[PDB]
Design a protein around this ligand. Structure first.
Ligand SMILES: [Zn+2]
Ligand SMILES: [Zn+2]
Lengths: 137, 699, 731
């Protein structure tokens, strides 16, 4: 039911924007970056991975991957809605510059929207494919 | 008329005994079937009696010290009076020097039995109100609640002090109107604090930074209360919010306990859900698991109940000891945890309001009655009352049942055999109104036995007052012993008094079994019959109804708890142990009126037989007012009818404190079930026959 | 120039009239011209001793001093999609590599040969080889997490004493004035916490009528009272925090809070930042006495007490390491009027790569000088650049090993300095030794690398590289001696010596450094003979010995000495020198031998005078540049022209007691002195206040405490000291 969001350019896996808060990130972060690497033009546009008490959820659009982690318990239904909101906003705002940048996190400032939107999904009072992540990796 | 008698004595002395004539012998005292008891209402209202602004006048004898009353034998010649309780003879006080026959002191006239004096000497303490607010509930619910509290603030005395404590995951004690910033002290609602701890952690008329005079603080508080927002902590999927209700309450108690101990104060708590983070925890934050049910408690599948109960029970006494009142207003769709918190308002004279949402006429209206005033613009409430009862040497007190605490005071008036809160001649009643009713159980160990009720309490005005009622009942005549006793019976008064003992035992665990062996006993000692001949059994007009009241009481929801939530059960009992005779009866045996073209409104039996299709019924369950429309009427004349019950309803649907829930249903409707369950072992007819078969047989 | 010997007993006027200049490594022309800037990186011995044996004979310390994040005038920024770094030791392809196979380059630190990639292409023309100082753009793998945003959490002590000092007011003012100038983009977050016996958090939501002070009184078990609005977005909440900065000073005017639970407060400050890390400014005014971290009072020494320092607890050291592990640095602002056990409090900043600031007996009305000082120091602090969650490593050619580090940071594994924050005013020093004889090479290099996150959320690496020659002759080791650098490295060493042993041992080791080196010199060559490079070695060491850090006989207080050592440990060589040996110029008769090149301004260049009252004059006025301040001492028999035309007074007697600064009068004389002063403070980024209060009787003649050549009742004169060394040298 918790957080971990990363947006990365599919081709090389160049990190575009992320968001994390702890008070480990370490492990699941590697996996996330493992996935980005593997993801290509032949990969599923919308998939769900199972990694124990955890569950990865992602979508891809215009060569950009929106990945999210959280306790499996979290609504898979709510997970993608969360990603969709990010997409449109992001594509609308930076969709056309993505294929030109080369620095890691050249959109850290997308940090704000991610978190203001992240909260609208992690509070019950405000209201595809599945594979063991261990595989794809 | 023994009835005019019962009537006038309750009207004048707000009391009603189980028997108005008592056993003059030891061989009858012991064989009393229904205990000598009184349903006592210390602060009942009446025809504007005269306040006595002069010291009451006490008896000169360390032990006795009763108050000068109409029973006292006077001697205007010698300016002397003999106490009726210990015969001790008294000298009149200086202010009574000019005492005369054709102009004597009020307390001596038989009319001023039951009279109230005022004691002015110390400078009265300002009243204290402490709002303790839950912030874990829906917005529409919180907005309603906020408005309701802002309203109560406009009614409060300019002198009164106010404090605000909001809570959710953490607990916040607000330091009022600190200019430019507005601050509060945050505490984890995860661990209890005594009050000595709390006192260290936190720091002409008196007032703290946390309790300020309404007149100086009302605009700030009104505004703060206006900005209050739901608990800032998110609530994840499938979880309940983290509500620290237990520590919030304890901090509230601690706050006052170290600021103003021993003076009228009102801790009004508002709950939007159960406590989900002990101490005082009621259930877990996993929605998967439901709050406990009576079934669950019976099958030992409710792990928080006892520990949670114990916590609020300790708090209840801490507050009751210090002399503070605990109010609980709980509104939500699920249960709140009343069963665990019941004692707080039960032991103190605190209120217990319950409903579905603060955003309703029900709560909003019930909440403002709390602050209803009298012919002087003052609250109909008293604080820190001390109830002390004086008896003739022949009478002893077994105990009391009602909102009170024992001041554990020893004296010959105390009986070995204790009932309810017993083993005392003094009880404390932290919060009371003109409705508060305690049951007092006595025991016997020319005529006339005497009991004196002395109630000291803090008035809304701030004035200290002493209410005094001295009643006197005839000692049975040796040559007419049981015949008189039988004549002096108050079937209603006794039914409620017998019910008090039953529920008290139930709430403090068969009980129906004890209730029956006494019904059967009473039936045999005062009934009429031929042994082994059921048909022969009859009962005086004096006892005829006791059986029915019993029928209803043993099938009521006061003893048959399942099919109700523990919270609903604790709520019902709470109110029944406070009410006066009349209301008590309405609870146990709802009144039912019939409305049809064929004759004006008429009261009819609580029997299925009374549910006519071409008739509109009005059922008054003290807790709910229900109107029924038989199949036919379910569709200027037809109107007068359709609204005849609606009109009468409004009237009572206001005087009553806990506004009763209103209901409009009809044959077929789902809500019709409430009528069908109060109507009708099995039915009364069968119940009666079985009672007769046992009445006429062996004793 | 000169390979000449000097007799310190005859010269006695050795100090030069113009600024001293750092030595020039004896390197081929082409190499030297690409060498790193000495202001950024430098060595105590420009001529590295080929063997430890040779190094030991010289009796001079080997080590480097660096100012790695200093504000540069022009910085090359390589955006290389690939960073060229030797495959063995990971050294950055620098200007001193050795290009051979014009597609293969030999690492100048571990000699491995590397294959230049088909991206680096004339590969020797590439920028990374033409600049000793250069900034790279770190790739996706040079960060453990998304670049953290800029987070500023201010922590004010609002006790009774604190309220009486009136510091809170100007701090809030400074902040208001510089809100827009804080390093950072739209991701910036700002916070606030006040405290006394309890911790005071402050929530800031646009939906509420005013901020909310959330108090946690549970001193023994702190926690964060809310999850969303304590650390707020500065951009979005500009208005909200501005009111709080205007409201804060007024919230405690009538306080009775005599105690301060700085310990618990810092723990709360820590929990609140743990999640993102950033900068924690802490403003404390008195000894901590409530709750964990409480310190006992100590009785201040006197000129009498001998040399009989260390932390009285480790709480602040542990807490610092905790902050450090969360990318949280702590800056200490102590404005205490009494002992506060800074020897302990300093640890919070020393081990978290922060910095401590000291304003002794600060008062809004009473101490005008501390006030203006704090003002200008806060100006710098608030508007200077900053790097976040960074680390630095110092590499140096096989054979040379670094063994001791000096500065504010946390040393993980040897070489890998943890820097929760990296400021442009921090200085570092290192001590090395020859682990393996340098017979192979004739050149060795040093490369420091700063990996950090910018205020604009970009991971960068700043790299400096230093190349020096190796020699095998004692005389050569001496010919390259950098007297100031050695002085600096010795100071740091002396500070550690104290904490480890005592002030006495510290002072002795210092004195022993001059003796053992000049003695070693003599054994290899009547009066006191030293090589040209060391003619100022006894003078600077003596100055060091009289400084408030190691001086003894003085009436100096506890925290003063500690703060003096804190500065030695954290400041760049330049300011150590400016502080220890202030530059003294006569200024009541400036002229035209100046640098009147600066188009329209002239700017006199008066000669530097040696620190002795034998140089002052009651007929003139003298200005002393102590680096951080510029005390202007006036003479009693001072000239009239200087009084009216420069001071704006008619006679000595009416020269306003505390004079915070000179007036700008329409006089050619004023224009001249104002020109000299402005040129001095333009040579630094930390605007130094200037007070003339130094009268011949203002009871602020601590101007004299800097005349380190004269003798004092409890300290030797420069001449005595020379006499004492010569007696030891040829014992
Ligand atoms: Zn008496
Ligand atoms: Zn290498």
């Amino acid at each position: 039911m918790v957080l971990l969001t990363m947006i990365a350019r599919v081709a090389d896996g160049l990190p575009l924007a992320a968001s994390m808060q702890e008070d480990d990130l370490q492990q699941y972060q590697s996996q996330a970056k493992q996935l980005f690497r593997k993801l290509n033009e032949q990969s599923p546009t919308r998939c769900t991975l199972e990694a124990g008490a955890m569950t990865f959820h992602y979508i891809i659009e215009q060569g950009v991957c929106y990945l999210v982690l959280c306790e499996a318990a979290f609504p898979k239904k709510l997970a993608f809605a969360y990603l969709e909101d990010l997409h449109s906003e992001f594509d609308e705002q930076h969709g056309k510059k993505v294929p030109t940048v080369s620095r890691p996190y050249s959109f850290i400032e997308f940090d704000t929207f991610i978190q203001k939107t992240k909260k609208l999904y992690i509070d019950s009072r405000a209201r595809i494919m599945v594979a063991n992540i261990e595989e794809v990796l | 008329t023994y009835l005019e008698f019962i009537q006038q004595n309750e009207e004048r002395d707000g009391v009603r005994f189980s028997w108005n004539v008592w056993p003059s012998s030891r061989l009858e005292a012991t064989r009393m079937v229904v205990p000598v008891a009184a349903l006592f209402t210390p602060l009942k209202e009446r025809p504007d009696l005269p306040p006595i602004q002069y010291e009451p006048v006490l008896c000169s004898r360390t032990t006795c010290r009763a108050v000068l009353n109409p029973l006292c034998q006077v001697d205007y010649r010698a300016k002397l009076w003999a106490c009726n309780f210990c015969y001790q003879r008294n000298q009149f006080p200086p202010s009574y020097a000019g005492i005369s026959e054709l102009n004597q002191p009020a307390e001596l006239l038989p009319q001023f039995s039951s009279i109230e004096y005022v004691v002015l000497r110390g400078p009265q303490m300002p009243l204290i109100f402490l709002y303790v607010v839950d912030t874990c509930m829906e917005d529409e619910d919180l907005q309603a609640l906020k408005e309701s509290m802002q309203m109560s603030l406009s009614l409060l005395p300019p002198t009164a002090l106010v404090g605000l404590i909001t809570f959710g995951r953490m607990v916040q004690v607000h330091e009022l109107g600190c200019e430019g910033i507005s601050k509060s002290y945050v505490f984890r609602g995860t661990k209890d604090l005594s009050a000595k701890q709390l006192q260290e952690m936190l720091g002409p008329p008196p007032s703290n930074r946390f309790l300020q005079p309404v007149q100086k603080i009302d605009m700030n508080l009104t505004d703060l209360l206006g900005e209050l927002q739901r608990d800032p902590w998110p609530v994840p999927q499938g979880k309940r919010p983290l509500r620290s209700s237990g520590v919030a309450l304890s901090i509230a108690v601690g706050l006052l306990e170290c600021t103003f101990p021993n003076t009228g104060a009102r801790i009004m708590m508002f709950i939007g859900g159960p406590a989900t983070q002990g101490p005082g925890m009621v259930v877990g934050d996993e929605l998967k698991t439901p709050i406990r049910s009576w079934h669950d408690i019976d099958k030992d599948n409710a792990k928080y109940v006892k520990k949670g109960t114990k916590h609020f029970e300790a708090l209840a006494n801490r507050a009751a000891t210090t002399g503070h009142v605990i109010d609980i207003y709980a509104c939500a769709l699920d249960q709140t945890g009343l069963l665990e918190m019941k004692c707080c308002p039960n032991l103190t004279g605190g209120y217990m309001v319950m409903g579905d949402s603060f955003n309703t006429s029900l709560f909003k209206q019930t909440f403002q009655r709390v602050f209803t005033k009298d012919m002087h613009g003052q609250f109909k409430m008293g604080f820190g009352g001390t109830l002390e009862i004086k008896t003739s040497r022949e009478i002893k007190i077994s105990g009391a049942i009602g909102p009170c605490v024992s001041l554990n005071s020893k004296g010959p008036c105390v009986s070995e055999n204790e009932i309810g809160t017993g083993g005392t001649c003094q009880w404390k009643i932290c919060g009371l109104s003109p409705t508060t009713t305690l049951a007092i159980y006595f025991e016997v160990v020319g005529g006339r036995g005497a009991i004196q009720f002395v109630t000291q309490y803090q008035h809304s005005s701030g004035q200290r007052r002493i209410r005094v009622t001295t009643i006197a009942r005839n000692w049975a005549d040796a040559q007419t012993q049981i015949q008189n006793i039988a004549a002096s019976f108050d079937q209603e008064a006794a039914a409620i008094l017998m019910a008090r003992l039953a529920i008290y035992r139930a709430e403090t665990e068969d009980v129906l079994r004890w209730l029956d062996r006494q019904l059967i006993r009473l039936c045999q000692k005062f009934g009429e019959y031929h042994k082994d001949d059921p048909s022969s059994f009859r009962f005086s007009e004096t006892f005829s109804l006791y059986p029915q009241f019993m029928f209803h009481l043993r099938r009521s929801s006061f003893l048959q708890v399942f099919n109700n939530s523990p919270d609903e059960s604790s709520y019902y009992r709470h109110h029944f142990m406070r009410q006066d005779l009349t209301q008590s009866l309405i609870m146990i045996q709802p009144i039912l009126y019939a409305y049809s073209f064929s004759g004006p409104p008429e009261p009819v039996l609580l029997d299925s037989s009374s549910i006519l299709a071409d008739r509109i019924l009005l059922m008054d369950t003290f807790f709910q007012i229900l109107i029924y429309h038989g199949e036919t009427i379910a569709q200027e004349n037809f109107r007068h009818l359709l609204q005849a019950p609606v009109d009468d309803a409004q009237e009572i649907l206001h005087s009553r404190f806990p506004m009763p829930r209103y209901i409009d249903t009809e044959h077929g409707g789902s809500q019709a079930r409430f009528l069908l369950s109060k109507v009708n072992d099995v039915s009364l007819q069968v119940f009666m026959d079985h009672l007769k078969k046992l009445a006429v047989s062996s004793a | 120039e000169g390979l000449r010997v000097v007799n310190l007993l005859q010269e006695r006027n050795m100090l030069p009239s113009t600024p001293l200049k750092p030595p020039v490594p004896n390197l081929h022309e082409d190499i030297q011209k690409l060498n790193c800037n000495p202001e950024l990186f430098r060595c105590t011995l420009t001529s590295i001793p080929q063997t430890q044996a040779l190094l030991n004979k010289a009796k001079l310390p080997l080590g480097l001093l660096l100012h790695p994040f200093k504000d540069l005038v022009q910085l090359p920024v390589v955006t290389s999609s690939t960073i060229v770094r030797c495959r063995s030791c990971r050294t950055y392809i620098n200007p001193f590599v050795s290009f051979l196979d014009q597609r293969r380059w030999k690492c100048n630190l571990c000699y491995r040969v590397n294959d230049v990639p088909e991206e680096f292409l004339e590969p020797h023309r590439r920028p990374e080889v033409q600049n000793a100082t250069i900034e790279f753009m770190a790739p996706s793998e040079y960060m453990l997490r998304p670049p953290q945003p800029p987070v500023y959490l201010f922590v004010f002590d609002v006790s009774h004493n604190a309220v009486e000092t009136g510091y809170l007011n100007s701090v809030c003012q400074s902040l208001l004035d510089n809100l827009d100038l804080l390093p950072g983009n739209t991701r910036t977050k700002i916070g606030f916490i006040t405290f006394d016996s309890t911790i005071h958090f402050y929530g800031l939501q646009e939906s509420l009528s005013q901020p909310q002070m959330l108090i946690v009184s549970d001193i023994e078990d702190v926690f964060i009272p809310m999850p969303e609005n304590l650390l707020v977005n500065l951009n979005e909440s500009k208005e909200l925090v501005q009111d709080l900065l205007k409201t804060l000073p007024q919230m405690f005017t009538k306080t009775l809070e005599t105690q301060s639970a700085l310990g618990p407060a810092l723990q709360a400050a820590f929990k609140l930042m743990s999640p993102t890390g950033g900068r924690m400014s802490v403003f404390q005014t008195q000894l901590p006495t409530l709750g964990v971290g409480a310190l006992k009072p100590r009785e201040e020494p006197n000129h009498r007490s001998s040399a009989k320092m260390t932390p009285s607890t480790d709480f602040y050291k542990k807490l610092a390491l905790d902050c450090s592990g969360q990318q949280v640095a702590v800056d200490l602002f102590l404005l205490s009027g009494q002992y506060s056990d800074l020897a302990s409090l300093g640890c919070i900043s020393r081990y978290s790569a922060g910095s401590v600031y000291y304003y002794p007996s600060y008062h809004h009305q009473h101490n005008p000088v501390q006030v203006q000082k704090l003002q200008k120091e806060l100006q710098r602090y608030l508007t200077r650049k900053i790097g976040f969650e960074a680390v630095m490593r110092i590499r140096c050619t096989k054979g040379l090993s670094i063994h001791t580090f000096h500065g504010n940071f946390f040393v993980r594994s040897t070489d890998l300095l943890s820097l929760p924050n990296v400021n442009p005013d921090a200085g570092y020093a290192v001590q090395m030794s020859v682990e393996e004889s340098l017979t192979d090479t004739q050149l060795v290099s040093f490369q420091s690398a700063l990996l950090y996150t910018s205020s604009k959320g970009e991971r960068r690496i700043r790299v400096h590289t230093l190349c020096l020659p190796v020699v095998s002759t004692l005389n050569d080791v001496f010919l390259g001696a950098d007297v100031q650098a050695i002085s600096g490295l010795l100071a740091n060493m002396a500070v550690d010596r104290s904490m480890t042993a005592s002030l006495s041992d510290a002072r002795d080791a210092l004195v022993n450094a001059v003796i053992d080196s000049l003695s070693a010199y003599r054994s290899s060559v009547p009066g006191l003979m030293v090589p040209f490079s060391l003619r100022l070695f006894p003078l600077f060491v003596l100055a060091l010995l009289k400084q408030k850090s190691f001086q003894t006989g003085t009436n100096a207080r506890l925290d003063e000495r500690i703060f003096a050592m804190c500065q030695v440990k954290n400041q760049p060589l330049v300011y150590l020198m400016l502080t220890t040996h202030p530059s003294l110029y006569r200024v009541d008769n400036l002229s035209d031998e100046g640098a009147l090149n600066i188009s329209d301004r002239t700017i006199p260049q008066p000669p530097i005078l040696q620190l002795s009252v034998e140089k002052l004059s009651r007929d003139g006025a003298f200005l002393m540049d102590a680096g951080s301040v510029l005390m202007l001492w006036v003479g009693k028999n001072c000239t009239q022209n200087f009084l009216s035309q420069v001071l704006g007074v008619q006679n000595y007697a009416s020269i306003p007691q505390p004079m915070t600064d000179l007036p700008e009068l329409d006089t050619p004389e004023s224009a001249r002195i104002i020109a000299f002063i402005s040129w001095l403070r333009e040579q630094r980024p930390f605007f130094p206040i200037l007070y003339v209060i130094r009268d011949e009787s203002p009871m602020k003649a601590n101007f004299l405490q800097n005349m380190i050549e004269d003798r004092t009742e409890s300290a030797l004169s420069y001449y005595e000291f020379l006499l004492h060394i010569q007696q030891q040298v040829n014992k």
